[PDB]
Structures are given as structure tokens and as C-alpha cells.
């Protein structure tokens, strides 16, 4: 199923050299405020079942470590040239068949919107049940699932302000409590750094895939922020492999510092409160000291969710509905069916219990990492066609538009990762990056792997007055 007479527009357009504005410091800032999200509190919470609170600080920095290792390779395409993830997805898969992951992956950002509005509730409802003792989880889930949709079309700077300041404001509060908890549970960081592991069983191998598969979504598609990084049009195999690692570590000094802290304060609220649930362990810790504040601590989680959320979870599935189903939704109806869609997945309970298995789920998406890197790196040796990636009939159209051997490789890749269960991701990424070269040298039969109109790549990025 594809659709005929297709149009490729300014939203997906490539970033030029006269637009880039993200230097490795400022990209290191979008990785600090990016290690700060409730997906991480909780992951590091439930870990305390099988390992102590230091082991999780070792697995934490361990995830992010393998995560910068994939970041390096993946980021490269985007920085060099300046493209969406929506745009680069078209290399291993077709230009009409690149939508298989572009969709499977725009369904995550919705899931992380259900799971995120769900704390908007816990926080809107904790502030009103500690004010009126009445509790309505699902009313708030819907009042919040309405507010977003409105401030989506007509948002003012007042939310924007809240963006950058939010992650830090919560990292500040998120440690302060750890003072509070280590002060009332009368334990020292030294006693606390060893209180988990009263139910060993899970392998550490699986303990690292967790924090891996938490980032996978952001890593596979960094293309979307990376395409604003100062890059040099006049640098070589050296000057451009040095800016690759300059960024690739500009990111590791933002994500592993910050997300070893939310990893901690989250395993601390567990083996020190009992609650992986932020909002709950929050009201419970600061309201067991100040309920004039436990309400200001839940007025925060509410306000900081109410600016983070939309940006990173609702915008993308919105613009994919007007793209993949043009005559069907508006920006006003894409936004609204997006909301309804996420809410209706019922995320929060999936997490709560086996979030450990939704992060071994969002980590069985390794073959896509191995497939995309193998392509921009091993199969096309960094040679790409800016002109063919923007035309219905290009050398990436393959079988009418879908690359069937790239979906096949992904499939062989998965089945070979069930031959190694505690190291799946590591063996689903290794298997797909080695098995994509052959399938691309087999299409190197039915299709060219390059074009002679590619000498125009520089025509797309250098300013045109």
C-alpha cells in the first residue's frame, strides 16, 4: 500500500550551513535536560530488586556509554548534511517505504505522552486530593489530555520559558529530597549505596540493555536536533571525523552526568521510600515535612510536564498524520487524534510493573540501529544523494518504493537475537549491521547504490540569495 502523486515539502527541508547554531556545548545542554525524564526515575527504581543502588549507578553510566557509542555513528549523517530523521530513514528503506520505522517510531513518542500526561494527573490530583481529599485519576487524565491540545496551536513564550528551566528545576528538587530522605530515613549515602538486591535474578547484561533501550528512540533519531550543529563545509576525512567525536563526547558529558543523578534519586526513592512513582514519593517525602510545599512540588511536576510533554511527544506524530494521510487530518485534527491515540494505549500500567520489559521492548529495536549505520557507513561508504532523496523516482525507490531486503534483514536480525536472550540488543545490532551489507550488495544488482546527480549535494546546503 502506497499512494500516487506524492509531494515532498519545506518541513523536511535540509539545514544549510547558514542556519546551523548548535555548538557541542549547546548540544551538551540539550543532553543534560534530556537525561531528565520520568522514564529514568522508574527504570532505576525497579532495578533495586535485583541489584544495589551503586550497581544501578554502574549500569546507568553503562547504558549511556553504549549509547554515545551508537550516537557517534548515527549522528554523523545528519551533522554532515543536515536532514530530518524523517529524511534519512529513506536510505536503508524506500522513499515511500521509509515510513515503516518513521511510523513504528512516531508511536513511541505518543506512548511517552500517555505515560507523561498520566503524571500530569497524579500531580493535578495529588494537589487537589491533598486539598479536598477527593480523587479522580481519569478526569485529570482527560483534562490534561485537553489542555495540551489547545496550547498546541496557540502556545505563548510562558511555556517556552518553562522548557529549559524545567529539567534543572526538577533535578534540583530531585536531589533536595534525597537530602530530605537520607535525613529522615537516617541513612548516609554510604549505607544507601548498597540497599538493593534483596531479590537477585535479573542479569546485569539485561540491566544495561534497560538504560540502553530507554535512549534507543532518541538515539536512532538524533537526526532531528543534530541537523543544526555547526559543521565545516571545508573540512576533510580528519576535520570531519574530529568534529564527529567532538560532538559524540559533547553529548556524553550531558547525558551521563545528569542521568546518573536521576538514576540515583530514583533508586533512592525506592529503597528508601518504597515508591518508584515520582509524584507519589514526592508528595510523600516533602509533604511528610511540608504540605505547603508538597503541593508546590506537585505544582511543579504539573507545570514542567505541561511544557515538556507536547514538544517532545505530540508534535511529531502530529506532522506525520498530515504527511502520511494528507487529505485526512488537519494540523488541528492531527493534533487531536494524536492525543486520543496515546491516551488510549494505557501506557502507565504497562510501565509500573514491567517497565523493565517495556525497556527490553524499546530495546529489541536494535536491528534498526544496525541497519541504518551499516547503510550510511558500510554500504554507501558515506556517499548519499541529496537529489534522489527528494524525488519519487530516485535510486532509493527500489521496489516501487519499499526496500524489501531491508525489512528482511531486520527480520533475520531479530530471530538471531533470540539465540542470545540476555544480550539481545547487543546481538540484534551486531547481526543487522553485518547482514545489511550482503542484502545491499544483492540489491547492488537490481539497483545502483549511488547516482551521478549527487555532485549537487553542495547545491542544497550552500546559501541561495
Curated annotation (Swiss-Prot):
Residues given in the record as Na(+) binding sites: 33, 36, 304, 307-308
Residue stretches spanning the membrane: 25-45, 53-73, 99-119, 139-159, 162-182, 202-222, 253-273, 294-316, 334-354, 357-377, 400-419, 423-440
Outcome, altering residue 37 to F: Strong decrease in uptake and binding efficiency
GO molecular-function term, one example from the UniProt record: metal ion binding
Comment on pH dependence: Optimum pH is 6.6.
Effect of substituting residue 215 to A/F: Little effect on uptake efficiency
Main location as per UniProt: membrane
Matching InterPro entries: Pur-cyt_permease (IPR001248), Uracil/uridine/allantoin_perm (IPR045225)
Gene3D superfamilies: Hydantoin permease (1.10.4160.10)
Activity regulation details: Inhibited by dinitrophenol, 5-(2-naphthylmethyl)-D-hydantoin (D-NMH), 5-(2-naphthylmethyl)-L-hydantoin (L-NMH), 5-bromovinylhydantoin (BVH) and 5-indolylmethyl-L-hydantoin (L-IMH). The affinity of benzyl-hydantoin is increased over 10-fold in the presence of 15 mM of sodium.
One Pfam family recorded for the sequence: Transp_cyt_pur
Effect of substituting residue 112 to F: Reduces moderately the uptake efficiency
UniProt KW keywords: Membrane, Metal-binding, Sodium, Transmembrane, Transmembrane helix, Transport
Family annotation (PANTHER family): NCS1 FAMILY PURINE/PYRIMIDINE TRANSPORTER (PTHR30618), PURINE-URACIL PERMEASE NCS1 (PTHR30618:SF0)
Role: Nucleobase-proton symporter that mediates the sodium-dependent binding and uptake of 5-aryl-substituted hydantoin compounds. 5-indolyl methyl hydantoin and 5-benzyl hydantoin are the preferred substrates, with selectivity for a hydrophobic substituent in position 5 of hydantoin and for the L isomer over the D isomer.
Protein name: Hydantoin permease
Organism: Microbacterium maritypicum
